[PDB]
Assembly symmetry: D2
Homo-oligomer: 233 residues x 4
């Protein structure tokens, strides 16, 4: 069970973000859905509303500080508080081994996957501090825990997400903010293992909700693999 009232999900227009927004709402939480994709983001808000939940869509490019600042202000204006943040927007666009990549790809992946998470947390934390605490979950990857051949920039970016996650967890541990990362392997989304199958968006959402749950109060600074056994070998 979740007793906080408001969650923010970035990248909530599709895939893991949409599923996790829906899961928060089904648990009784008011959800701000943030994304570049306004069509999909309103699609997520409408699915929540048709199921009996509360949700608003706010368009935001997480690479832009002013828009992320406005997004967290929008959370406060819409619902008065922010208890949970799922910083999940990310991209994966590489086509080759490290020597065959280009600087445009590097810049784009790092901007969304690292700067986006950093900016989001940078603006979420003061609002959570004002309320006496909160819980943040960042989407890393099994590529944040080991090699990702032909996705070396992506792996660098998801490693970096774990570094931000652990550092913020320690910095704000005594201030009521928990910070964790979920580390999916291959998940059946549009961006698309010892168990012999790929994972499902509902399985990532369930892990995010565990990390945000009332009885996860002692869980902070971890990178939770949801990976069908991939990192165990």
């Amino acid at each position: 069970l979740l007793s906080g009232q408001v969650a923010l999900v970035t990248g909530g227009a599709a895939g893991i973000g949409r599923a996790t927004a829906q899961a928060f709402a089904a648990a009784g939480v008011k959800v701000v859905v943030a994304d570049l994709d306004s069509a999909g983001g309103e699609g997520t808000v409408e699915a929540i509303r048709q199921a009996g939940g509360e949700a608003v869509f706010i368009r935001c490019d997480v690479t832009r500080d002013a828009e992320v600042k406005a997004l967290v202000e929008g959370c406060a204006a819409a619902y008065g508080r922010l208890d949970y943040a799922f910083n999940n927007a990310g991209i994966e666009i590489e086509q080759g081994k490290l020597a065959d990549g280009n600087e445009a790809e590097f810049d784009a992946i790092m901007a969304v996957n690292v700067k986006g998470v950093w900016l989001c947390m940078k603006h979420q934390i003061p609002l959570m501090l004002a309320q006496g605490g909160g819980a943040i979950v960042n989407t890393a990857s099994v590529a944040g825990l080991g090699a990702a051949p032909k996705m070396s920039i992506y792996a660098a970016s998801k490693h970096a997400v774990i570094g931000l996650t652990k550092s913020a967890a320690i910095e704000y541990a005594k201030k009521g903010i928990r910070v964790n990362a979920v580390c999916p392997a291959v998940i059946d989304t549009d961006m698309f293992h010892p168990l012999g199958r790929v994972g499902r968006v509902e399985e990532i959402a369930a892990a995010v909700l565990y990390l945000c749950s009332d009885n996860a109060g002692f869980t902070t600074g971890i990178a939770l693999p949801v990976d069908g056994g991939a990192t165990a070998i």
Copy 2:
């Protein structure tokens, strides 16, 4: 709904983390077999479950004894017909010195309960779960399974070993419907720990200072992690060592 399995086995269920997790399973609607050397504490866990409206039974078992563990798993099927979830949580922590100051009796005792006990339990749980087409196992490791434990080197070795058993079994049985995970608690406030720091408050001050959160963990927090690892929507989660540690391993 979150756990659709019918039957859980908790070893070390007479006290502490095991007692609380047995209660958490029962509160979720699961019938619980409580296994322990401590008959009094074990029947006490069962009584608390029953008074709360759940179902449980106690089966005495020394997890270091192969014949007793085999009979314990047989007793689960006799009592409730199957075994969906197993929490292999019995363990001891008895060292008093640095590595060169420990003794072979301590080594043998710690390794027997903490490693052989987990191995025996899995050895007899897995065939039952194979026959059912699936099951989930959670083993109690520790933050000492993930890093040094000064003045507890044998304990650390034993909890590292639990993670090795966990990951190996997770890969071996992944395609047979069995998931195997480990929970890695830091210091948890059990009834025994509380008695200890009531007599010596420095133990509470020191233990809280070991964790970035500035407190020790709660038995209900370990229980909730175990139930997550057993939950229906944790079907893609296997072979992990989940720290529940107030940030301790993030440092």
Copy 3:
């Protein structure tokens, strides 16, 4: 022992980079020293030459693709090939917890510590491919293995170095290119004395201890060692 002929050290004007440049040269390797700090970089080369070794300084801002390209080609122009690369240039400039940092600090740290390593590797690898091999060592940090309070951007950047390292190690494992990261804790350099008992050993590390770890990772008998993050930390990560 090291059978390769040519090493490149970025951030070689000072500290860990200077000591590792000197160590390569002591092992008989010709060294290209690269840094923004020309006076320090020429100082490293002067010290190597004064001890009987061979080295040259090439000024390079590792955040700039064209400068890194010219630097790597300059290695081949000076000495004919490039067998070893120590991608060690880095900065540490944060002054607050995550929510107190600023975007300029983020951009600067990520540019040197992540883009610099990525650019260096992407232009070192083609030469090593043509050679049938090489050894790359990237300077990560214990901050790439765990939290670094009040240095969250730095920790993100050094985590990213490990991701680059492991990914390239797998990509090129069958092409003879080993890629590893050394992970120092606090080392007694100007980066440390600028910032002004956390280490179980009771002291901070020495630059020659990092250099020795780099040289092990580059050594002929390290041919089965790739994709690792080697902590040189007085025990810090073992807790």
Copy 4:
């Protein structure tokens, strides 16, 4: 590059242990070769002596406290001190997945691989303390860092080696004793002498005994004084995934 005078190598009669004993001796260190196998052990000593080095053989079952104590005493008896210890004796004997294993296998693997390392360190440490320091390397495995299907007891045992290593490293850090683990993947030992195991390494081959020996010597080297409590994978990329 190694200023210590005396190294002890357990499991020194064959394979990684023989190779590391030879490497120590080639670096000018005096070597105590320790093993159950007296014939292979003296063979290691003979190879060292043929190359101009200094070694002796001492028989020891590392599962027996009295023999391990006598082994360390024997190091001091032969050479006066003990600077380096490579606790490398180990076995790998399982035949099936976890539920198909047996208790005799469990007991044997844990006794050599865990108790043997524990006993060795327990008796090495006081001698090193009295000298003002020393360096210990324990042989773990990639199976100490992840799953080993059909070798679950072995994986448990090598995980345990890493736990002993890290704990002792922190306990004795300020007393000058460094404690590290080397973590080999598949190594071409005379027992190994197939193509399937080679292919599961990203490098595409199995490792050489000389590559493990060189990692042990780095961990014992004079300029490894800030390296302690680590598990060093020598694995052709296996653990980088």
